[PDB]
Amino acid sequence: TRQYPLSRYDDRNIADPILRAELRKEVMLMCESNDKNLTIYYVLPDEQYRPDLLAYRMWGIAELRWVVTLAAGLEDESQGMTVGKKLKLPPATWIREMIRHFQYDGQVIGTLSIA
Amino acid sequence: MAPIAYGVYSQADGVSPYLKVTLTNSQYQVTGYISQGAAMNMAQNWEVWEGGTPPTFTLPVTFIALNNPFIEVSGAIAALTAMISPELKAANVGGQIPERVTLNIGRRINITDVAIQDLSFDLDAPRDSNGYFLKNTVNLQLTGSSIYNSSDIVRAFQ
Amino acid sequence: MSKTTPTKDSIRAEFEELVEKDSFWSKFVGSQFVSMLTLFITQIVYRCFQYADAALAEGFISTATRRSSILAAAETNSYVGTKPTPSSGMIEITATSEDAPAVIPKNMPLISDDQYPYMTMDVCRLVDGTGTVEVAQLEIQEVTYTVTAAKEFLEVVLSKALTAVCYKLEVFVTTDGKTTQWSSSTMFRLAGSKSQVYVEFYKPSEQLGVRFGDGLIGQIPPEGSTITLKVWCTNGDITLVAGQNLTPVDSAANLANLISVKTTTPITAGTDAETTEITRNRAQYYLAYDDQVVWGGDYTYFLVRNIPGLSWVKAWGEGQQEKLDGAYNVQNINKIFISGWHPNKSQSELEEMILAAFKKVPNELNKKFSYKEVRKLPFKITITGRISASLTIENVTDELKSALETKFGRDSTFFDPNRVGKYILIKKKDVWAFIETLGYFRDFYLEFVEWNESNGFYDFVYLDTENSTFNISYEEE
Amino acid sequence: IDPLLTLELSGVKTYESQEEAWGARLYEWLNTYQGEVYGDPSWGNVLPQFKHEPTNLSHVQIAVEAMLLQKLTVDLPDIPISGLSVAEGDAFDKLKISIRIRDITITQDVVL
Amino acid sequence: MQRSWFNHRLTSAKQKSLLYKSLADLVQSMMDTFVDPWLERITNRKSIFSMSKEDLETRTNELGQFFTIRTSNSSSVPMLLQQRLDEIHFKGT
Amino acid sequence: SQYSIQQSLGNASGVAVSPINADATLSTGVALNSSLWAGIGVFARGKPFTVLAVTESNYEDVLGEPLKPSSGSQFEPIRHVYEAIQQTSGYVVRAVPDDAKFPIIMFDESGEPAYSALPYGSEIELDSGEAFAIYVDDGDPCISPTRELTIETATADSAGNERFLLKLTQTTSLGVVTTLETHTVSLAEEAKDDMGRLCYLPTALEARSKYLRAVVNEELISTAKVTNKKSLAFTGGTNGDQSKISTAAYLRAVKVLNNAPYMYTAVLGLGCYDNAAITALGKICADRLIDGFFDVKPTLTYAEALPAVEDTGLLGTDYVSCSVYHYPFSCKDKWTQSRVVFGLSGVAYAAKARGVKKNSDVGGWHYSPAGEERAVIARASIQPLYPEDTPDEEAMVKGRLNKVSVGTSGQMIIDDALTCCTQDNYLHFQHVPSLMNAISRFFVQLARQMKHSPDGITAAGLTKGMTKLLDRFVASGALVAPRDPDADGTEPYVLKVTQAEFDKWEVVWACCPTGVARRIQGVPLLIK
């Protein structure tokens, strides 16, 4: 039959490490920005091994695991992150839209003035 | 453990647990009495048999404010209207639903997914000194989440 | 060409219309009478037809799917598929009482918790009550046959279970108290009575058996003589984990309480029966391993593949010697000179191994083969120039010498890189290209000293790495 | 030789012995708690919810059993539920949950 | 570089199981032996002083061997390159 | 926390799960209390010469695992119990030959241990030495698994009496150690726990302990002390040989089963081929007014199996309530997938029980053990022993055996509904004699209920009881109208009661039962 395995969630859908790099750059900018459209929640003790566990409970998807990993700056899940750290999550559809734009026409990125 | 419950939820009523109707969801529970007038219907469509229809339920329940009206009548009706009322603007557009509740009957017949499609009752019953209702008879109309198969239905009873 | 026959509903239809000929029985059509008789005749013709079709289909080599069919194909191809082999290994044996004999012989069974018979193959010597013997899951099933008739290639077949689990077979032809051993031998050669044994055979009833031949192909046992068939059987792959105790029985049933058998050395890595298609493919392609050698290049290739470590091997026939010499030779008539190099072997050793392989492979006619001396032809290289100061002259010299001996030295693998029986001459361009690829040069110039050119037949040209001149300096100010 | 077991190792290769196979699958479902499995931490038994409630609060017990059964069903639609039974023991310290898919009647001793 | 790292998303009985520790520690050994040294070298590359030797002479010979000093003081190689790179602003003297 | 899982339970509270091992068993169920069966068998574990009320909860546990069919002729009982317990419980009796011995460990005054083994039934005595001893009684030779004990001190009693805790466990070959009990006991005769639990050693052993029994010197108990001993294993235990069982053991089992005051509605052969045992079981069935499910040796062809019934000697009017079967086939093992042969007795009893108890008020025994309503077996990979040989129906029915065949759906079906009654009278059917047995049993029950009562009301009570019994019978449909209305009309019952003296009420009762057309015939005819 006609079947192909894929999933339209991976931020790493972009094969360029450098492009993935600036992607995580601006998502970090926004996350450690104090924008109100971000979530307001601290750390859980068991998040040391499983940072995406909170992502699963509040969203049901593990796609936010790299988001929280870059938010916490963890070297490894073997080490833990301090409980109570300020953690911020934006609406997922917003990330979906930005990545959609970036992988169809993520050309100007910064600012478009006029055609 | 379980979230907040309303109606004759505790055993302090001293009534047979079997005769109690129970509805439960992730955050609300309502317990009442199996009142007369209950009915159910399942059917299908044809013209050559075309297909079937989901289960239907018509459950009238009577509630009595024996000791604590606030938890037994007011809170009960509030939870009921919360459940029937579709919450589709709870600042969570990524998943808003009208919500469905699970029904337990006779403590042994369980309907995992049923939709409270209709509710009605009367508010003319006498009240207390504060003013909370003493009695009500709330009739409910319920629908199955799908046209359940025989293998789905017959093997769900105790 | 091709064969066709009309379908069932068709044949029923024309059958009923032709039986409708006689008016007195024509109108029975439409009744369950005619339909039942019709379905009966159609089912019987269906059986005969498509079973003849299945027979002709199975008549082909690649169409065989049944185990019996594919084993019959293998027997016809004179090959036997890889039967399952039980795992073998070590087991500890302890004595529980003084009555336990310190010697436990081979040829005794051991009963597992599943009564899997564990044959012993050695003599267990209890040292202070502790002994060991080689143990593997095997059983010996013994049957016998009596010579019914003196028919050439008389058939003696076995049962389905025996055919299924016949890991090994032993045939003992016993006459009036005199027993000889006969084995299964294929690939018949040499005139006269080659041997006095049986031959293999298979029957599509999923049965294996033997054929008693006559004349110079074996001999028939006399009528009334017995043929004992001892079949070594097993269950296929066998898993034996350390930490279990056995239950010896029969002659050792009374020894079971006196002798404890303890699993200490794990026993696994047995074999099973592989897939039908792959067995068929293996049978139909195993004929490549047949020693079919038909040219001197084939000889050289086979010698290379049979003797590891050969630097190179190459033969040169009468025409090759003729073109080497440039003139007619009265001696170079059907004579082939074979040369080669092996770093670990001398010319005499090479000739000895060549001759031994010649005896081992009896495939020649009207051609003589001799061994040709291999003449070493070393040559030196003088490189002159300067390198960067970042490099060390001594280390560069060492590395270059190592690489040159590896690639184009006296013990290099460049002569026969592919191990196909070839010798490739070492060229000045090749050596200089090798050193350029090595790339330890900055500004250098190369000269070749005592370039002993090799004909490429038997002369051993190689770079004199040890005596090479390395005027390496530093690209200074 | 050493045989094997079914607890997270193997009952049978696939569903040949249907009902015991489903019972096995449910067994490795129920032998796991939240936060002890990747991908779906909610997967498995939900003892962390229904641990140690008062044994006599029949409303909460029926609520928790209903929710657990519905979520395990929506989790594994292949195996629907036929019979769930809750039976107290000789002492107040023992409860038994008996689940049968019409024949299996496999029971586990729980404590509240 | 991980101790009992498979001790967190695993039920305790299967943690104390016989073969699960076998698989866990074999794969921990395998990652230790064939993924981590890349992590160590990249972490060394992060710091000018931490860089492993191979990285040091790699950065050395990327430009060319004529721009360096053939010294055996490998510990000094990082600082020597540090001065060689920060001197570019004052290297007319 | 919820993340931790333990193996044994002491003071800490947690949820445990099964360990990772190589083998495991299960047995769960609830008692029937409806209709029971009894029979002698040889199994694993369990006390020899002992009755055991076996249910779905203990069938695999206290009877041990099934044995290898090629390991002697002891596989018939295990197959029978396996096939029967899945639907019905029983009162199975087990005994072993004298060759079996159970082990024992003795603790002297200092508490030093000594291992010994004694034949089952032998009583151990304590001399001047040998302060006390503990012997295992479950029947396991302590070889698979092994029994270990760990003993140390513990907190004292409210009276301050020194107490010690000991825990028993079973350890498998692979090393899994599953505890069975952990109890704190004291040497003090009046040792009472704060719960009021007695901590006296022998009383504790007999009451709470279930696998080990202890003998203690009553004169050295005061001077006895305790020691710290860990994982003490019993040695010398042996199950003995079970292939050959003495007729003396057979008759001992017979008489203890006779003396056993436990209800059982039927008796099962369990594959025994001892002729004397079969006859004893037949006479037990006869004088207890029950049904029997005997079987003949499957290994014999039809020609000699037909005389085998009177060769055994169970033909006669005494053995009228029993049935004898034959299974000339070989099926596939459920575990070892081998050619295994065992009788149809357990499944036949199960079919009869389920059929009779389909009815809820009193049950119907008028059901025929033929047809696929009950006679559906289809175990696995059936293989006829003698495919060419076929049974002879008329000689079979004359011999009063039971023959089998295959139905359309491939199930194995018993195509007979007759008992072992030599005479062709109506007793030679199967359901009808069971009908009389059931009605007689009910009459006995009611008569005993009304027994020992002052006169003048006894007649009225018995009449009312019989009338209501008749009502239940006509509801059940067993009581049907007479075949011939010329003599008794359509009224199918009669009852009288008379008196002889101060005692001896003579009651007489006759009834019309029904039938299920054992005589089988048919003839369609033509019209042209």
User: Is residue C363 a contact partner of residue C293, using CB atoms and an 8 Å limit?
Assistant: yes
What Å distances lie between residue D58 and B65, C10, D42, CA to CA? 20, 72, 24
CB-based contacts of C409, cutoff 8 Å, min separation 6: C462, C463, C465
The DSSP letter of residue C419 is S
Other Cβ atoms less than 10 A from the Cβ of C126: the count is 17
CB-based contacts of F189, cutoff 8 Å, min separation 6: F200, F221
Q: Cα(B106)–Cα(F463) distance, rounded to whole angstroms?
A: 44
What Å distances lie between residue F42 and C268, F25, F264, CA to CA? 36, 19, 19
Q: Cα(F82)–Cα(F87) distance, rounded to whole angstroms?
A: 10
Q: Which residues of E touch F17 (CB under 8 A)?
A: 11, 13
Q: Which residues of D touch A53 (CB under 8 A)?
A: 35, 41
List the single residue in C114, C243, C244 with the smallest CB-CB distance to F336.
C114
- According to DSSP, the β-strands at F266-268 and F291-295 are parallel
Q: Cα(F489)–Cα(F504) distance, rounded to whole angstroms?
A: 31
Q: Cα(C259)–Cα(D62) distance, rounded to whole angstroms?
A: 61
Residue type (1 letter), A19? L
Q: Cα(D78)–Cα(F491) distance, rounded to whole angstroms?
A: 59
- According to DSSP, the β-strands at C443-449 and C459-463 are unpaired
Q: Cα(F197)–Cα(F201) distance, rounded to whole angstroms?
A: 12
CA F285 to chain centre: 15
Q: Cα(F271)–Cα(F344) distance, rounded to whole angstroms?
A: 10
**Radius of gyration of chain D measured on its C-alpha atoms:** 15
CB-based contacts of C453, cutoff 8 Å, min separation 6: C377, C461
Contact B1 D82 (CB under 8 A): no
The chain D residue lying nearest E10, using CA atoms, is D36
In the numeric block, the tokens 């596989």 are attached to F75
The chain D residue lying nearest A61, using CA atoms, is D39
Residue C330 DSSP SS3 = coil
Cα dihedral value F20, F24, F28, F33, nearest 10: -160
Alpha helices per DSSP H over F387-482? 393-399, 431-450, 458-476
CA D59 to chain centre: 20
Asked if C240 is an interface residue toward chain D (Cβ–Cβ < 8 A), one would say yes
Helix axes F302-312, F275-288, angle to 10 degrees: 60
Cα dihedral value C423, C429, C432, C434, nearest 10: -50
CA F22 to chain centre: 30
Asked if E9 is an interface residue toward chain D (Cβ–Cβ < 8 A), one would say yes
**Radius of gyration of chain A measured on its C-alpha atoms:** 16
Q: Cα(F30)–Cα(D100) distance, rounded to whole angstroms?
A: 14
Triad C458, C462, C464: Cα angle to 5°: 145
The DSSP letter of residue C28 is G
The DSSP letter of residue C279 is H
If we measure between CA atoms, which residue out of C211, C258, C215, C214 comes closest to residue C96? Answer: C258
CB-based contacts of F257, cutoff 8 Å, min separation 6: F38, F40, F51, F93, F284
Q: Cα(C33)–Cα(C17) distance, rounded to whole angstroms?
A: 15
User: Got the DSSP string for C152-205?
Assistant: TTEEEE--HHHHHH--EEEEEEEETTEEEEE-B--S--SSS--BS-BEEEEETT
What Å distances lie between residue D24 and A38, C203, D8, D76, CA to CA? 44, 45, 9, 13
Residues in chain B: 158
Which two three-digit tokens encode residue D45? 């038994």
- According to DSSP, the β-strands at F412-414 and F493-499 are unpaired
If we measure between CA atoms, which residue out of A36, A35, A41 comes closest to residue A64? Answer: A41
Question: H or E segment at F147?
Answer: strand F146-154
Other Cβ atoms less than 10 A from the Cβ of F133: the count is 21
What Å distances lie between residue D16 and B152, D12, D21, D78, F184, CA to CA? 22, 8, 7, 15, 48
Q: Cα(E54)–Cα(C231) distance, rounded to whole angstroms?
A: 65
User: Is residue F487 a contact partner of residue F510, using CB atoms and an 8 Å limit?
Assistant: no
The DSSP letter of residue C100 is S
User: Is residue F346 a contact partner of residue F358, using CB atoms and an 8 Å limit?
Assistant: no
Alpha helices per DSSP H over B71-148? 75-84
Cα dihedral value B145, B149, B150, B152, nearest 10: -60
User: Is residue C135 a contact partner of residue C89, using CB atoms and an 8 Å limit?
Assistant: yes
Q: Cα(C99)–Cα(C252) distance, rounded to whole angstroms?
A: 12
Q: Cα(D110)–Cα(D88) distance, rounded to whole angstroms?
A: 9
Residue F501 DSSP SS3 = coil
Question: H or E segment at A72?
Answer: helix A65-72
Contact D35 A56 (CB under 8 A): no
User: Is residue C409 a contact partner of residue C465, using CB atoms and an 8 Å limit?
Assistant: yes
Q: Cα(F251)–Cα(F254) distance, rounded to whole angstroms?
A: 5
User: Is residue C415 a contact partner of residue C460, using CB atoms and an 8 Å limit?
Assistant: no
The DSSP letter of residue F449 is H
Residue E34 DSSP SS3 = helix
Q: Cα(C430)–Cα(C433) distance, rounded to whole angstroms?
A: 5
Residue F225: phi and psi, rounded to 5, are: -125, -170
Which two three-digit tokens encode residue E67? 């721009």
If we measure between CA atoms, which residue out of B136, B154, B147, B132 comes closest to residue B51? Answer: B147
User: Is residue C398 a contact partner of residue C465, using CB atoms and an 8 Å limit?
Assistant: no
Cα dihedral value D83, D88, D94, D98, nearest 10: -10
Order of strands, edge to edge, in the sheet holding C312-316? Answer: C312-316, C335-341, C368-371
Q: Omega of the bond prior to D80 within 30 degrees of 0, cis?
A: no
What Å distances lie between residue C67 and B75, C52, C73, C163, F103, CA to CA? 76, 19, 10, 11, 54
Residue type (1 letter), C318? E
Which two three-digit tokens encode residue F28? 């769960």
Q: Cα(B64)–Cα(B33) distance, rounded to whole angstroms?
A: 9
Contact F173 C243 (CB under 8 A): yes
Order of strands, edge to edge, in the sheet holding C154-157? Answer: C154-157, C207-212, C199-203
Q: Hey, which residues does C354 pair with through a beta bridge?
A: none
Dihedral of CA F64/F70/F75/F78: which sign? positive
Write down which chains contact chain B via at least 3 CB pairs under 8 A. Answer: A, D
Q: Hey, which residues does C199 pair with through a beta bridge?
A: C211
Residue type (1 letter), C245? N
Triad F358, F360, F365: Cα angle to 5°: 60
In the numeric block, the tokens 């029983």 are attached to F90
Q: Cα(A48)–Cα(E8) distance, rounded to whole angstroms?
A: 10
- According to DSSP, the β-strands at C469-474 and C375-387 are parallel
User: Is residue C197 a contact partner of residue C186, using CB atoms and an 8 Å limit?
Assistant: no
Other Cβ atoms less than 10 A from the Cβ of C119: the count is 20
In the numeric block, the tokens 């019952």 are attached to F493
Which two three-digit tokens encode residue C395? 């280390």
Q: Hey, which residues does F497 pair with through a beta bridge?
A: F507
Q: Cα(F216)–Cα(F208) distance, rounded to whole angstroms?
A: 17
In the numeric block, the tokens 């498995």 are attached to D44
Q: Cα(C367)–Cα(C333) distance, rounded to whole angstroms?
A: 8
User: Is residue C348 a contact partner of residue C434, using CB atoms and an 8 Å limit?
Assistant: no
Question: H or E segment at F287?
Answer: helix F275-288
The DSSP letter of residue C29 is T
Question: H or E segment at C377?
Answer: strand C375-387
Other Cβ atoms less than 10 A from the Cβ of C469: the count is 13
Which two three-digit tokens encode residue B51? 């297909």
Q: Cα(F9)–Cα(F28) distance, rounded to whole angstroms?
A: 22
Triad B144, B147, B148: Cα angle to 5°: 85
Q: Cα(F176)–Cα(F16) distance, rounded to whole angstroms?
A: 14
Q: Cα(D67)–Cα(B27) distance, rounded to whole angstroms?
A: 11
Q: Tell me which of E9, E16, E20 to substitute to probe the interface with D (most D C-beta atoms closer than 10 Å).
A: E9
Angstroms from D2 CA to nearest CA on chain C: 7
Task: Report how many helices (DSSP H) and strands (DSSP E) chain D contains, helices first.
Answer: 2, 3
User: Is residue F5 a contact partner of residue F59, using CB atoms and an 8 Å limit?
Assistant: no
In the numeric block, the tokens 């007793």 are attached to F427
Conformation bin of residue B106: beta by default, left when phi > 0, alpha when psi is -120 to 50: left
Residue F293 DSSP SS3 = strand
In the numeric block, the tokens 């003579």 are attached to F506
Method used to obtain the model: cryo-EM
Question: H or E segment at C454?
Answer: none
If we measure between CA atoms, which residue out of C146, C124, C125 comes closest to residue C135? Answer: C124
If we measure between CA atoms, which residue out of F345, F366, F358 comes closest to residue F433? Answer: F366
What Å distances lie between residue B142 and B103, C53, D59, D65, F406, CA to CA? 10, 64, 22, 22, 52
String of b and e for F207-236 (b: at least 16 CB within 10 Å)?
Answer: eebebbbbbbbeebbeebebeebeebebee
CB-based contacts of B45, cutoff 8 Å, min separation 6: B51, B52, B53
Q: Which residues of E touch A49 (CB under 8 A)?
A: 8-9
Other Cβ atoms less than 10 A from the Cβ of C262: the count is 15
User: Is residue D99 a contact partner of residue D81, using CB atoms and an 8 Å limit?
Assistant: yes
H, E, C per residue of F251-284: HHHHHHHHHCCCCCCEEECCCCCCHHHHHHHHHH
Residue D72: phi and psi, rounded to 5, are: -70, -35
Angstroms from C124 CA to nearest CA on chain D: 22
Residue C132 DSSP SS3 = strand
Breaks (C-N over 2.5 A) in chain D follow: none
CA C423 to chain centre: 29
Q: Tell me which of D62, D78, D104, D112 to substitute to probe the interface with B (most B C-beta atoms closer than 10 Å).
A: D62
Which two three-digit tokens encode residue F155? 């907190």
Q: Which residues of C touch D2 (CB under 8 A)?
A: 239, 241, 243-244
Which two three-digit tokens encode residue B29? 């529970």
Which two three-digit tokens encode residue C164? 């299924």
Which two three-digit tokens encode residue C104? 């436990």
The chain F residue lying nearest E13, using CA atoms, is F5
Cα dihedral value F266, F270, F276, F280, nearest 10: -10
Q: From start to end of C246-374, where are the E strands?
A: 259-262, 312-316, 335-341, 368-371
CB-based contacts of A27, cutoff 8 Å, min separation 6: A67, A70, A95
Resolution (Å units): 6.0
User: Is residue F421 a contact partner of residue F428, using CB atoms and an 8 Å limit?
Assistant: yes
CB-based contacts of F224, cutoff 8 Å, min separation 6: F109, F131, F132, F187, F216, F217
Cα dihedral value A8, A14, A20, A22, nearest 10: -100
Residue type (1 letter), B98? P
Q: Cα(C267)–Cα(C238) distance, rounded to whole angstroms?
A: 8
Q: Which residues of A touch D48 (CB under 8 A)?
A: none
CB-based contacts of B59, cutoff 8 Å, min separation 6: B21, B38, B139, B140, B142
Other Cβ atoms less than 10 A from the Cβ of C45: the count is 13
In the numeric block, the tokens 């003196």 are attached to C150
What Å distances lie between residue E9 and A53, D39, F265, CA to CA? 11, 10, 55
Helix axes C32-58, C8-19, angle to 10 degrees: 130
Triad F39, F42, F45: Cα angle to 5°: 115
Contact between chain C and chain A (3 or more Cβ pairs less than 8 Å apart): no
What Å distances lie between residue C362 and C350, C355, F194, CA to CA? 19, 11, 97
Question: H or E segment at F332?
Answer: strand F329-332
Residue type (1 letter), F218? E
The chain D residue lying nearest F174, using CA atoms, is D2
Angstroms from D100 CA to nearest CA on chain B: 11
What Å distances lie between residue F283 and C155, C453, F251, F267, F419, CA to CA? 59, 113, 12, 11, 15
Q: From start to end of chain D, where are the E strands?
A: 83-88, 95-100, 106-110
HSE-up (13 A, CA, CB side) for residue E63: 10
